[PDB]
Every structure is written in structure tokens, then in C-alpha cells.
């Protein structure tokens, strides 16, 4: 279990511990650079857009184009450190993609880690949202939003077929890899109750290498596809999965090859009030 975010009220600020370290963070930071696209969407959901002074515009999702106003701090894998310095932020918010540059970032300004725990998605998700909301006095609003998300989870959990199995896959160039429970997309199995065609897929950040022979041998009832091409600006998932083998699966037969929106699933990783809700609905609409 990843250490949670913990905070102590210091009057004009909070003293804040997370899994990478500790920071004094002002109440109401007014100049926040945000490198997690999920948190950006939480900032939008809580009407905190004017607090955001820089975003990774090379990877700004279509669903967050209201932020194309903001100065750019590069990409999520290509941080523009000079632009971050030059903006003189009072807070920087990162997740897993920037952990290795923690120290550089913290030299510049207080740097908060809001990564998701793959083994405890929901508790880490609520902890991230609330920790952010608490900086602004908005815990009440945030908890209401979270409670709405949980009604969706409970509903979605109910319309679930106990006898059908899913495979989660990610496509990239002409390469497929597999994800299962406890992975960066595990909410599908771990939270929404959809069974896994294969319980022993080793968790890895960009998945474990497979091919279409594997997909047909497993013969899942659903295939959830996350097309990383779209994120990288590349060809498409429909290409590599247009083959005779995939076409024979139960998932093809029953029109359950579901292309998940990668901006939400890959980039945001469901780490926001908006993305997570949309993602619950997407799965719910794709499986009923
Ligand atoms: O540490 C990470 N990546 C290091 C960069 C090595 C990846 C090579 C190419 N990646 C990309 O160009 C890329 C671009 C945008 C978003 C991404 O995730 C990407 O991997 C990382 C961490 C959590 C989740 C990810 O997914 C990551 O990668
Ligand atoms: Fe990546």
C-alpha cells in the first residue's frame, strides 16, 4: 500500500506528507502547475481553473481544451523545466510519470505527488481528490462529487454478468500488450467487478507483450482496448485488431470489442473527478 497523502493545518498553510516527501503548501495556492491530467480535471470540476498557471499542452486532452488558454510546461513525459521556473509557481502537482524528477521540481516549488495506487485505486483516488480539495476549503463539494461517483460504481457493479470475462489490452505501433487486475486499468476488474479472462497477467507500466493468437486462445467475452497510438500521435488499434483471429472471439461475435478513450484511460488514468465518472459510465454503457 502506497503511503497516502497526510496533512496538518498550519494556519496560513498545510504541512503535507506524501510518498515522495513533505512540503509546506500555502492555503489557496493561486499559481499551480499541474502535470497530472486527472488532477487538472478535478481542478476544473471544483471551479479552480483560475488557479492553474501551467499545463502539459503537448498532451492536453480533447476533454480539457478549456486549458489551451494556459502557458505550456511541455509534455507529461517531456517536462519543460525552464518554463516551470519562469512561471514561479507556488505549487507543482505530479504523479508517476514525473517521480524521477522530484528533486529538480521541488527545488523550484513545493511539489505534491498524487499518484494512484494500483492495488488500492479507490482509497488512493479519494485521498488525492480530498487532499487537493482541502487546500481550498472545498472538501464538502468534493465529497458530494465522490459520493455521486460511488453511486455509479454501485449501479455498474449490479448490472454485471457473473459469467463473462474481459481482457484489457493496449495497442501501440503494431504491438499489443495485456493488463489485468491490480494494473493501471484495473478498475474494470477490481472496482467494477468485471471478471478477468486471465488472472495471472503480470502487472507492468506498459503491459505485457501478447498477440492475437493469445487473444483467441483466451477467448474473452469482452475486449477493452486502450489505443496508445492516439496519445503518441502515430496508425490505429482498429488496424492491428482487424484480423481473422480476433474476429472469431466471443467479444467480436457479440460486438464487445470496446475502444476506450485513451485520453481518459491512459493519460488521465481516472485520477480526476471528471475522468473517473466518465470512465464508469463508458464501461457501464459498453456492457449493458
Ligand atoms: O515513467 C514513465 N515513463 C517514462 C518515459 C518512457 C516512455 C517512453 C515513451 N513514452 C511516451 O512517449 C509517452 C508519452 C505520453 C504519455 C506516456 O505515458 C508516454 O509513455 C511512465 C510512468 C507511469 C505511466 C506511464 O505511462 C509512463 O510512461
Ligand atoms: Fe506511458
Amino acid at each position: 500500500a502506497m503511503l497516502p497523502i497526510s496533512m496538518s493545518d498550519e494556519g496560513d498553510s498545510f504541512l503535507v506528507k506524501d510518498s515522495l516527501g513533505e512540503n509546506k503548501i500555502p492555503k489557496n495556492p493561486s499559481k499551480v502547475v499541474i502535470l497530472d491530467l486527472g488532477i487538472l480535471d478535478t481542478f476544473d470540476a471544483l471551479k479552480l481553473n483560475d488557479k492553474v498557471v501551467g499545463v502539459p499542452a503537448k498532451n492536453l486532452p480533447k476533454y480539457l481544451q478549456q486549458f489551451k488558454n494556459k502557458p505550456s510546461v511541455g509534455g507529461v513525459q517531456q517536462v519543460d523545466f525552464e518554463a516551470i521556473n519562469a512561471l514561479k509557481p507556488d505549487l507543482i502537482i505530479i504523479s508517476g510519470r514525473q517521480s524521477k524528477f522530484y528533486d529538480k521540481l521541488k527545488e523550484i516549488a513545493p511539489t505534491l505527488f498524487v499518484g494512484l495506487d494500483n492495488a488500492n485505486f479507490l482509497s488512493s483516488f479519494e485521498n488525492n481528490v480530498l487532499s487537493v480539495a482541502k487546500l481550498y476549503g472545498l472538501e464538502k463539494e468534493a465529497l458530494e462529487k465522490i459520493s455521486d461517483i460511488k453511486n455509479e460504481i454501485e449501479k455498474a457493479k449490479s448490472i454485471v454478468d457473473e459469467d463473462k470475462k474481459a481482457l484489457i489490452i493496449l495497442t501501440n505501433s503494431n504491438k499489443i500488450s495485456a493488463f489485468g487486475p491490480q494494473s493501471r486499468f484495473g478498475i474494470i476488474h477490481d472496482v467494477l467487478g468485471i471478471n478477468a479472462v486471465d488472472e495471472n497477467i503480470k502487472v507492468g507500466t506498459h503491459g505485457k507483450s501478447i498477440n492475437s493468437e493469445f487473444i483467441l486462445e483466451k477467448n474473452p467475452d469482452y475486449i477493452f482496448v486502450v489505443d496508445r497510438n492516439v496519445i503518441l500521435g502515430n496508425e490505429r488499434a482498429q488496424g492491428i485488431l482487424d484480423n481473422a483471429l480476433v474476429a472469431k472471439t466471443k467479444a467480436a461475435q457479440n460486438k464487445k470489442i470496446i475502444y476506450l478513450d485513451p485520453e481518459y484511460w491512459y493519460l488521465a488514468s481516472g485520477n480526476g473527478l471528471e475522468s473517473l465518472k466518465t470512465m464508469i459510465l463508458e464501461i457501464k454503457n459498453a456492457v449493458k
Side-chain angles (χ1 to χ4, degrees), residues 1-2 4-23 25-61 63-67 70-76 78-81 83-139 141-156 158 160-174 176-186 188-288:
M2 178 184 303
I5 300 177
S6 92
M7 309 165 53
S8 173
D9 187 344
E10 306 292 325
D12 59 348
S13 62
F14 289 94
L15 183 63
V16 182
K17 175 70 177 306
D18 61 40
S19 57
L20 309 183
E22 167 184 290
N23 291 273
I25 302 169
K27 288 174 170 173
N28 257 295
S30 56
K31 299 176 84 192
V32 185
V33 161
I34 303 175
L35 298 173
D36 187 287
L37 287 149
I39 305 290
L40 185 55
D41 90 51
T42 292
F43 263 73
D44 183 86
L46 304 172
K47 300 179 145 50
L48 287 175
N49 304 54
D50 54 343
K51 308 297 180 179
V52 176
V53 300
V55 306
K58 286 194 196 307
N59 308 114
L60 185 73
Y63 82 100
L64 294 168
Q65 291 304 293
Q66 64 274 38
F67 287 105
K70 310 292 193 166
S72 169
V73 294
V76 298
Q78 227 173 277
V79 177
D80 181 339
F81 295 98
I84 296 174
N85 259 282
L87 295 170
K88 303 291 160 176
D90 50 25
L91 179 67
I92 298 167
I93 308 187
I94 70 170
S95 44
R97 295 185 167 94
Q98 308 88 30
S99 299
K100 69 187 130 303
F101 303 121
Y102 187 55
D103 291 321
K104 303 201 37 164
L105 289 176
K106 201 170 174 177
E107 318 294 346
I108 301 174
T111 294
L112 178 66
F113 179 78
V114 295
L116 291 160
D117 181 350
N118 280 342
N120 301 281
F121 177 81
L122 252 164
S123 63
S124 76
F125 174 84
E126 280 196 64
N127 177 239
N128 292 345
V129 162
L130 292 169
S131 288
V132 169
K134 181 174 307 106
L135 294 173
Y136 296 96
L138 267 22
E139 297 96 321
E141 301 80 327
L143 272 164
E144 272 153 42
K145 292 302 220 309
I146 290 165
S147 179
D148 180 55
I149 288 174
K150 291 181 197 256
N151 295 343
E152 293 299 328
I153 285 158
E154 283 296 299
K155 276 147 80 216
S158 312
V160 147
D161 196 327
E162 316 144 321
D163 198 42
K164 281 186 205 280
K165 339 271 269 200
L167 182 55
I168 309 171
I169 70 184
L170 177 135
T171 47
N172 182 134
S173 289
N174 66 346
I176 304 175
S177 48
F179 293 81
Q182 309 289 283
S183 74
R184 71 193 292 166
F185 309 118
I188 295 168
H189 309 295
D190 301 331
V191 176
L192 297 181
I194 302 188
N195 288 311
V197 76
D198 185 350
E199 301 265 64
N200 311 321
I201 298 158
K202 187 185 158 120
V203 171
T205 309
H206 302 93
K208 304 279 112 150
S209 185
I210 50 156
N211 58 8
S212 281
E213 309 289 350
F214 176 97
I215 291 175
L216 170 80
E217 283 151 6
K218 293 305 171 200
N219 200 23
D221 306 287
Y222 320 112
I223 301 158
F224 290 108
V225 185
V226 177
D227 191 3
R228 192 167 173 269
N229 296 306
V230 168
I231 296 328
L232 270 297
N234 280 344
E235 69 267 50
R236 294 296 114 119
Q238 287 80 6
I240 188 81
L241 295 172
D242 177 38
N243 63 65
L245 299 183
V246 173
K248 280 213 286 277
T249 58
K250 291 202 222 108
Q253 293 179 337
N254 300 121
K255 294 134 226 280
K256 298 301 177 172
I257 297 167
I258 307 298
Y259 296 90
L260 299 169
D261 183 332
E263 293 181 348
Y264 290 90
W265 284 83
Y266 186 68
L267 271 181
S269 305
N271 200 17
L273 284 176
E274 314 194 327
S275 36
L276 175 56
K277 175 159 175 189
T278 303
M279 289 161 64
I280 305 323
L281 292 196
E282 200 173 8
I283 297 306
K284 182 162 60 53
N285 281 321
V287 305
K288 52 55 172 307

